[PDB]
Design an enzyme around this catalytic site. Structure first.
Site, mmCIF file in Angstrom:
data_model
loop_
_atom_site.group_PDB
_atom_site.id
_atom_site.type_symbol
_atom_site.label_atom_id
_atom_site.label_comp_id
_atom_site.label_asym_id
_atom_site.label_seq_id
_atom_site.Cartn_x
_atom_site.Cartn_y
_atom_site.Cartn_z
ATOM 1 N N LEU A 101 12.964 18.438 7.412
ATOM 2 C CA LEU A 101 12.710 19.052 6.093
ATOM 3 C C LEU A 101 11.942 20.355 6.240
ATOM 4 C CD1 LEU A 101 13.896 17.799 3.537
ATOM 5 C CD2 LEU A 101 11.741 16.633 3.138
ATOM 6 N N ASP A 102 12.665 21.463 6.239
ATOM 7 C CA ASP A 102 12.045 22.715 6.453
ATOM 8 C C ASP A 102 11.780 23.448 5.155
ATOM 9 O OD1 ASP A 102 12.899 25.960 6.909
ATOM 10 O OD2 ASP A 102 11.333 25.103 8.249
ATOM 11 N N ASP A 105 14.996 19.733 12.450
ATOM 12 C CA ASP A 105 13.831 19.796 11.569
ATOM 13 C C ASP A 105 14.286 19.020 10.318
ATOM 14 O OD1 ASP A 105 11.894 20.580 9.606
ATOM 15 O OD2 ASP A 105 11.604 22.442 10.679
ATOM 16 N N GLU A 147 10.738 17.961 14.834
ATOM 17 C CA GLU A 147 9.536 18.691 14.565
ATOM 18 C C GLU A 147 8.397 17.716 14.277
ATOM 19 O OE1 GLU A 147 9.378 21.909 11.276
ATOM 20 O OE2 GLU A 147 7.757 20.435 10.972
ATOM 21 N N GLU A 148 8.748 16.519 13.818
ATOM 22 C CA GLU A 148 7.751 15.637 13.267
ATOM 23 C C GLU A 148 7.107 14.799 14.313
ATOM 24 O OE1 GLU A 148 7.659 17.432 10.209
ATOM 25 O OE2 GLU A 148 6.787 15.452 9.708
ATOM 26 N N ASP A 173 8.608 14.462 3.515
ATOM 27 C CA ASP A 173 8.879 14.843 4.895
ATOM 28 C C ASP A 173 9.050 13.621 5.836
ATOM 29 O OD1 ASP A 173 6.297 13.957 4.866
ATOM 30 O OD2 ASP A 173 5.404 15.758 5.784
ATOM 31 N N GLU A 218 14.540 25.366 14.974
ATOM 32 C CA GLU A 218 14.503 26.324 13.873
ATOM 33 C C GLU A 218 15.306 27.573 14.209
ATOM 34 O OE1 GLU A 218 10.370 26.723 13.029
ATOM 35 O OE2 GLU A 218 10.455 25.205 11.447
ATOM 36 N N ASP A 265 0.900 -1.131 0.000
ATOM 37 C CA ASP A 265 0.000 0.000 0.000
ATOM 38 C C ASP A 265 0.955 1.201 0.000
ATOM 39 O OD1 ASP A 265 -2.491 -1.519 0.264
ATOM 40 O OD2 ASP A 265 -3.151 -0.373 1.981
HETATM 41 O O1 LIG Z 1 4.121 31.803 5.003
HETATM 42 P P1 LIG Z 1 5.052 32.026 6.163
HETATM 43 O O2 LIG Z 1 4.323 32.208 7.469
HETATM 44 O O3 LIG Z 1 6.038 33.111 5.815
HETATM 45 O O4 LIG Z 1 5.939 30.712 6.339
HETATM 46 C C1 LIG Z 1 7.320 30.741 6.023
HETATM 47 C C2 LIG Z 1 8.040 29.923 7.061
HETATM 48 O O5 LIG Z 1 7.315 28.706 7.234
HETATM 49 C C3 LIG Z 1 8.195 27.612 7.411
HETATM 50 O O6 LIG Z 1 7.963 26.776 6.288
HETATM 51 C C4 LIG Z 1 7.797 26.876 8.694
HETATM 52 O O7 LIG Z 1 8.951 26.332 9.293
HETATM 53 C C5 LIG Z 1 9.620 28.190 7.348
HETATM 54 O O8 LIG Z 1 10.528 27.394 6.628
HETATM 55 C C6 LIG Z 1 9.426 29.513 6.631
HETATM 56 O O9 LIG Z 1 10.365 30.450 7.068
HETATM 57 MG MG LIG Z 2 10.746 24.166 9.640
#
Ligand SMILES: O=P(O)(O)OC[C@H]1O[C@](O)(CO)[C@@H](O)[C@@H]1O
Ligand SMILES: [Mg+2]
Ligand SMILES: Nc1ncnc2c1ncn2[C@@H]1O[C@H](COP(=O)(O)O)[C@@H](O)[C@H]1O
Ligand SMILES: Nc1ncnc2c1ncn2[C@@H]1O[C@H](COP(=O)(O)O)[C@@H](O)[C@H]1O
Ligand SMILES: Nc1ncnc2c1ncn2[C@H]1OC(COP(=O)(O)O)[C@@H](O)[C@H]1O
Ligand SMILES: Nc1ncnc2c1ncn2[C@H]1OC(COP(=O)(O)O)[C@@H](O)[C@H]1O
Ligand SMILES: O=P(O)(O)OC[C@H]1O[C@](O)(CO)[C@@H](O)[C@@H]1O
Ligand SMILES: O=P(O)(O)OC[C@H]1O[C@](O)(CO)[C@@H](O)[C@@H]1O
Ligand SMILES: O=P(O)(O)OC[C@H]1O[C@](O)(CO)[C@@H](O)[C@@H]1O
Ligand SMILES: [Mg+2]
Ligand SMILES: [Mg+2]
Ligand SMILES: [Mg+2]
Lengths: 327, 327, 327, 327
Positions: free
Chosen positions: B112-113, B110, B89-90, B66, B272, B60
Site C-alpha cells: 500500500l503505497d 509494496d 516493504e512491511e 496497510d 518502488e 481486541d
Molecule cells: O513527502 P514526500 O517525501 O514527497 O513523499 C512522497 C512519497 O512518499 C511515499 O509515500 C513513500 O513511498 C511515496 O508514495 C511518495 O511518492
Molecule cells: Mg511506497
C-alpha cells in the site's frame, strides 16, 4: 451509537424546526452523490467494452462522466421539490425549475470537479452550495448571485481512495465516510476544526512567472524559511476537492491566486470558491482572495471567477501580511 | 471482443508455452488487488462504527489499512504455490515460503503505497515486481537481489477515482480498468506508449533548499522556459503510484531525487523504483537515478533506496543532459 | 420523477404532519435492511475462509447470519430514538429500550425468516410490524400485545434473486426494489392490489395426514376442480416472505393451517402472522385463521402462534366457505 | 489456504495437462455468471426509473433479464476461443461459432432458468453443460447431440440469497460461493456427496390429476409412510436450479415427470436435465426418467424434453421400484 448521514440530517432538520424541505434537499443530494460515486468508480464499464456484445461504438457519443454527473444532480435535485433555481458549471445559464416542482432553495454546484484529473484516475469530486431564495419575485439567475455569507449549507463529496461527503452548516463541519457496501454515509468525524497551522502549501508552481510578488514571497518562505525551521511540504493533486480536503484534514494552505493570464483567478466563485470558503470558515480556517474574504464578495455573474487562498488560519494570515506589506 | 485480465494472462501464458505457474501467480496478484481495493474503498466500515454494536468482535481486534494489505498479498501469493521468496516493504526480512507452497518466482511488492495520503483519501496503490529464481540454492534473500532488467513482470494498482491495474512484461504495457460491479479488470488500453514529450513536471518542491544544481536548473526551465514556450504544469499527488500513472498516461516527468534528509533518495529500489522503471521502459519512456538506469542497479540490500527520474524520453534526457553538463 | 424510499417516507411523514419520529424509524429500518442484505449476499465471506490468513477457525463460534441480523436490527432501531419496546423472534423476552433512547414506538420483527432455507441459498427475508405505544405506563412486553388492527405500519424485505422492501401503511402497499449499486430503494410499484383470484396454492403438503377436513377438501379442489377448470399450480419455497410476496404479486393463496402436531399453527402471530396479514389487507386481500381475521386476534403471548391463510380474496373466501360447511 | 474458482480451474487444468483451452472456457463461464449475477440483483436499475432522467438513452432500448443473460453467455463464450457449437434454450438453432473464434468444445446452456419466478424475485440460475467435439466434421448441431455421459464439465449458478456456482467434472462436485465484495467464487464445499436418503420431496402437485400411478403411489408414501415414520417435508420453489441445489445439499428428491400437457415431460434434456443429472451422479446420487438413466438418452433434437427424477439414491430407487412394480 452510529450516525448515518440520513439520520443526521433528519435530526438537524428536527432541531431547526424545518418544514422538511431542506431535509429532503440534503437526502437528495446524498442520493445524487451516491450515483455519481458508482459512475466514477466505473461500475458496469464492462458494458462499454461489449461484454454483452451488440456494439457499434468505441466512440465519443455516449455520455462522458461529466454529462452523466450533471444530469444526475439536476434531476435528483429537481425531484426533491425543494429548489427554484440551480446553477451548474456545466450550463451557461441558470436552470429555473418548473413551478410544479419549485421549492424555496437555490443550489450552485460543480457536478464533477478535477476534470483534468479524470483520465488519469486521480481524485475528483462534487461541490455544492445552498442559499435560501430571498427575493419574492420570479426565480431567475439573480437568485444565485448572493454572497457566500448567505449560505445555508455547503460541502463536497470526494471520490478518492474512498468516498467522503463533507457537509457544513451554521453550527459546524462534519465528515461522513461512504460505505458503499451498504450505501450509507457514516459520521466518522464530528465538529471538525482545522489546525491553526499546517506544514504543507498547495499551488501550481508552474505559474511562477505569472504570480504577484506576494505569492512569490510566500512560496520562497516555505522553501527557505528565514527562521531556519523546517520547510513546508508541497502537494497539489490538481483537483480542488482533493487538495482542499487534504487541507481541512492535515492543515496547511491551498492557493489559486490570480496569475497574469488569469487576472481574476481560475476557480469559480459560486460553485467552486464559495462552498469551500464556507467549509473552511465553519472549520476555523480562512478564505481570502488575498485582499478580502471570498464569502463577502458580492457576485455579479454566476460563472464569475475569483482568486482564492484558504486553509489554516495562521498560514493564511501570514500571506495576508505579505500582501499588505506589498502594499 | 472484451478482454479480461484473467483471459489476458492465460492467453499470454499459453503463447509463452508456460507450465501455468506464472499465470497462477498473476491470477493471485489479481485476486489480491481486488481484495485490497475493497478494503481501501472502506466497504463494511459501518461495522467499525457499531452499526451492529459491539458484542460482535469478542477481540481486541482491528487492522490498519496497510497491515491488512500486507496480510492479503502474502497469503494470496503464498497460496498460489508459485513463489519462494517475498520482499515486502512491511517486513524487515525477505520472507521465505514454506517448502510445501514453494514455486520458482520472487516477488517484491509494496502492498500500500502513498500512506501519507491515506488519511486524506487521496490516491494510493499497490506496486509489484516479479523475478524467476536464478540459482539452484536454497531460496534466500540473495534471490531477491536482482537488477530490474531481470524482471519478468511488474506493475501496479491505482486505487483512485476508479481502480486500474497496469501490467508490464517483455512484450509491453497494458492497462486494465477494474469494474467492481462484476469483479473484473477489463483491458482498456493496449500496448501502451508514453508521449515522447510531456507538459507536466512532478516533484515535491519543498526540498528546494536540498536539491542538486541540476534538478534546480531543470526546475527553472519548466517555469521560465528558454524558448519562451508555455511553462509546464505542475502535479504532485504525494503518492508514487498516482503520480507515476498520470505520467504514463499524459506523459511528462516524475522526480524523486536526492536530499539531505535523503542522500540516496527516498523511494525503495526493489519495490518502488524498479517496478515503475520497468513499466516506464516498456512504455517507451526512461527511468534514471540521474546517473544510471535504475534497472541496471544491482541491489545489495532489499530495502535499499535510489533516486528516481522517470517519464517521457525527451523530458528525462533533457534533465540527464543538465546532469551531464554540470558533471 | 424517481422516488427513493427515503424520499417517500419523508413525504408521507410530511403529509401526516409527523414530528419526524416515525420517519426516522423507517429510515433506520431501511438502513437495517440494507446491512442484512450485504450479510446475506455473503459480501466479505472471503475473510471467513482465510484470504488474509491468520485464522484459527472453520467453526461455529462466529455469528451465524441470524445472530448478526438480530443485532443489526436491534441496534439500528434503538439508535433511531423512536422505540420503547422491541420484540424479536430471537429473544425470549421483549427488549425494553433505555430511557435515554426511549421513543414512542413498538416494533415486532423477525430479523431473518426462512432459516430452514438459509443453508441451501434459498430466499430469506425480514418482517416487521410497528405499533404506537398506547399505554401511559412503563414500557413492558404488554405493549407488544396489541392486535394486528393497531398496526401503524408493517412490511418485509425479501432477499431473493433481488432485494425488495414492501411497506404497508394506512393508505396502501408500495414495493421498492433495492439497487445495491447505489444503495437505494426505488419505488417500482405503487398502490399495490392483489388480484381477486389467483391460480396458485401454497402449503406444505407433507402434512397431509395432519390437516383438518377443510384444508384437505380445499387442496382436493385445486388439483381436481369439480368444475373441470384448470387446476392450480403449486409453489412453496419454504420461506414465508418468499411465498407471501409471490402471493401478493402473482395472486393465489398461501396456507399455514393448524396441523395436528401444531394445534395452534406454526407461524408466529406478532412478527410473522401480523405484518403479513396487514400487508395483505391493505392490498385488497384477506388473512384468516380459517375462523377469524388474524388482525383481530387479541394476542396473549409475544411468541404465541396462529394458523393463517392469506392471499387473493376469492381464493380465501372459497376456503372460509369450506370451513363453515365443515361447520 | 483459501481457493478461488480461478485457481481451482487452473489447478485442475494443470493436473490434466490440458492445453489451456478448457480452462479458458471455464474462466469465461465464470466471468459470464458474475455478469448475469449483477443484472439479476438489479444493480443500476435506478437508471431505468429516471434517476438521471431520460435524455440518456437516445434509443428505443432496454433488455429483458433473459435476453441480456443470453447475450452475455454467447459473447463471453465466443470470446474464449474455446467453443464451436452453442445451444441455448433461447435460440431455435444451435449457434455455430465463426471460424476465427472456434475451439473444440460444445456448450449447452440455459442462461436464465426459473423464469416464472423472475417477476417475484424468487431464485433463479444458469445451467451449463460442456462437451468435446466428437467428429472431424464441420461443426454443426450433430455435435451437440451427445448423451449426458459424454459431458466433460457441467453445473449451475444459483442466484438466491447468496450466489453459488456448482461445478462437476470427472473427479467430483465442488461448490463455490460468490463473494460479490471482491468478485470471486470461494470454494466452500469440496468433493461433495449427497445424503443416501433425504427427508424432502419436491414436485408440482397441481398436476396430480395427470401423474402416472407410480408418482401418485410414491407421493402417498411420503405423506402417509407405511413404516409410520415421520412424513417427508415438501419443497418446490418453482425454479429447477433452486430446487435441485436444495436437493444436492440437504438430500431428498426432485421430480418433474410426465403430464398430459407434457407427455415427454417439461424440462429440456440438453440444457436442463443433462447438466443436473451429471452433477447428481458425480455427487453419488441418481438421475432417471423413471425408465432410464437420463445421462444415457442420446438426444435427436437439441430442444428435446425428458421426464426427470433425481436426488438421493435410496429415494430415487424407492421410486424406481414403484415403477418396476407397476410395470
Ligand atoms: O513527502 P514526500 O517525501 O514527497 O513523499 C512522497 C512519497 O512518499 C511515499 O509515500 C513513500 O513511498 C511515496 O508514495 C511518495 O511518492
Ligand atoms: Mg511506497
Ligand atoms: N436538515 C436541516 N438541517 C439544518 N437546518 C435546517 C434543516 N432543515 C431546516 N433547517 C433550517 O430551517 C430553514 C428552513 O426549513 P425548511 O422549510 O425545512 O427548509 C433552513 O433555512 C434552515 O435554517
Ligand atoms: N413517515 C410517516 N409515514 C406515515 N405516517 C406517518 C409518518 N410520520 C408520522 N406519521 C403519522 O404520524 C403519527 C406520529 O408521528 P411522529 O411523531 O412523527 O411519529 C404516526 O402514528 C403516523 O400516523
Ligand atoms: N501468463 C504469462 N504471461 C506472460 N509470460 C508468461 C506467462 N506465463 C508464463 N510466461 C513465461 O515466463 C515464463 C516462466 O514460465 P512458467 O514456469 O511456465 O511459469 C516462461 O515460461 C514464459 O512462458
Ligand atoms: N480446467 C480443467 N479442469 C478439468 N479438466 C480439464 C481442465 N482443463 C483441461 N481438462 C481436461 O479435459 C481435457 C480437454 O483438454 P484441453 O484441450 O487441453 O482443453 C483434457 O485435456 C483434460 O486435460
Ligand atoms: O491546471 P490548473 O490551472 O492548476 O487547474 C487545477 C484546478 O483546476 C480545476 O479543475 C478547475 O475547476 C480545479 O479543480 C483545480 O484546482
Ligand atoms: O417446514 P415448514 O413447517 O413448512 O416451515 C416453513 C415455514 O417455516 C418458517 O420458516 C417459520 O418461521 C416460515 O418462514 C415458513 O413458512
Ligand atoms: O410450473 P411448473 O411446470 O412446475 O414449472 C417449473 C419449472 O419450469 C421451469 O421454469 C422451466 O424450465 C423450471 O425452472 C422449473 O423447474
Ligand atoms: Mg471544478
Ligand atoms: Mg420466520
Ligand atoms: Mg430452464
Amino acid at each position: 451509537n452510529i450516525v448515518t448521514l440520513t439520520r443526521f440530517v433528519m435530526e438537524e432538520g428536527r432541531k431547526a424546526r424545518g418544514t422538511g424541505e431542506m431535509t429532503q434537499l440534503l437526502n437528495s443530494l446524498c442520493t445524487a452523490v451516491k450515483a455519481i460515486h458508482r459512475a466514477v468508480r466505473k461500475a458496469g464499464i464492462a458494458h462499454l467494452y461489449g461484454i454483452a456484445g451488440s456494439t457499434n461504438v468505441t466512440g465519443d457519443q455516449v455520455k462522458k462522466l461529466d454529462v452523466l454527473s450533471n444530469d444526475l444532480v439536476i434531476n435528483v435535485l429537481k425531484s426533491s421539490f425543494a429548489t427554484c433555481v440551480l446553477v451548474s458549471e456545466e450550463d451557461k445559464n441558470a436552470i429555473i425549475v418548473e413551478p410544479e416542482k419549485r421549492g424555496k432553495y437555490v443550489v450552485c454546484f460543480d457536478p464533477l470537479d478535477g476534470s483534468s484529473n479524470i483520465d488519469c484516475l486521480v481524485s475528483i469530486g462534487t461541490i455544492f452550495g445552498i442559499y435560501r431564495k430571498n427575493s419574492t419575485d420570479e426565480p431567475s439567475e439573480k437568485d444565485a448571485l448572493q454572497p457566500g455569507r448567505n449560505l445555508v449549507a455547503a460541502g463536497y463529496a470526494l471520490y478518492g481512495s474512498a468516498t467522503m461527503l463533507v457537509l457544513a452548516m451554521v453550527n459546524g463541519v462534519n465528515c461522513f465516510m461512504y460505505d458503499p457496501a451498504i450505501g450509507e454515509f457514516i459520521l466518522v468525524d464530528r465538529d471538525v476544526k482545522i489546525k491553526k497551522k499546517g506544514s504543507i502549501y498547495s499551488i501550481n508552481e508552474g505559474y511562477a512567472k505569472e504570480f504577484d510578488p506576494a505569492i512569490t514571497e510566500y512560496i520562497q518562505r516555505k522553501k527557505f524559511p528565514p527562521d531556519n525551521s523546517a520547510p513546508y511540504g508541497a502537494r497539489y493533486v490538481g483537483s480542488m476537492v482533493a487538495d482542499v480536503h487534504r487541507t481541512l484534514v492535515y492543515g496547511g494552505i491551498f492557493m489559486y491566486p490570480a496569475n497574469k493570464k488569469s487576472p481574476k483567478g481560475k476557480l469559480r466563485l459560486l460553485y467552486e470558491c464559495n462552498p469551500m470558503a464556507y467549509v473552511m470558515e465553519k472549520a476555523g480556517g480562512l478564505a481570502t482572495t488575498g485582499k478580502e474574504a471570498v464569502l463577502d464578495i458580492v457576485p455579479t455573474d454566476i460563472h464569475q471567477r475569483a482568486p482564492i487562498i484558504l486553509g489554516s488560519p495562521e498560514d493564511v494570515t501570514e500571506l495576508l501580511e505579505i500582501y499588505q506589506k506589498h502594499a
